[PDB]
Amino acid sequence: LKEDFPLSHVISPFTNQERREGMLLNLLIPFVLTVGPWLEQPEVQLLLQTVINVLLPPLAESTSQAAYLALKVILVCFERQLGSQWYWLSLQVKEMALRKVGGLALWDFLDFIVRTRIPIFVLLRPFIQCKLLAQPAENHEELSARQHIADQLERRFIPRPLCKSSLIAEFNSELKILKEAV
């Protein structure tokens, strides 16, 4: 029942900041993982909007990490149908780093993007090199892996995983790790 029971109903009552960390961790990630049922465009739109809302409110480290995981999984799974609007997302990811939402998981997300270099990378490659290296980089734990990303996209051979199936293994492993983290 797509028309009568859209996904919006089950996600609406738990948007309020009461326990949305747990909701996002163990109600949405498994949903997309196990159906990644051919979802229709509008429900995908609603889902993506809801997830990205947490990242960029119209704050805690754990909830931000779970938000990043939700965005990553949604992004990698729906690569066939979401890509109709890459530009749109590619703009809402600039403010992401502009205002520095999330302490350290931001760099993890960006390095993952570089590694897999899903189509969004074709738009972020210029913005992630000239205006992100030259910009002042304060010396602390944030820069521990910075050189790693810097070198990653320079010339390294890129052994992409054959299929999403290979990546889903690491996804599930880190999902479990985050589950015990809570």
The ordered H/E elements are HHHHHHHHHHH
Which radius of gyration do the C-alpha atoms yield?
Answer: 17 Å
What structural class do the secondary elements suggest? mainly alpha
Biggest pleated-sheet summary: none
State the share of residues found in helices, binned by percent: 55-70%
PDB class: membrane protein
Keywords: ion channel, calmodulin, HEAT repeat protein, membrane protein
Entry title: Human NALCN-FAM155A-UNC79-UNC80 channelosome with CaM bound, conformation 1/2
Name: Protein unc-80 homolog
Structure notes:
This protein is mostly helical and 182 residues long. The protein is 62% helix and 0% strand. It is globular and about 50 Å long. It is classed as membrane protein. Keywords: ion channel, calmodulin, HEAT repeat protein, membrane protein.
Write the layout of secondary structure elements.
Elements: H1 7-11, H2 20-34, H3 41-55, H4 61-77, H5 86-92, H6 94-98, H7 105-116, H8 121-127, H9 130-133, H10 146-152, H11 164-181
Helix pairs in contact: 2-4, 3-4, 4-11
PDB class: membrane protein
Keywords: ion channel, calmodulin, HEAT repeat protein, membrane protein
Entry title: Human NALCN-FAM155A-UNC79-UNC80 channelosome with CaM bound, conformation 1/2
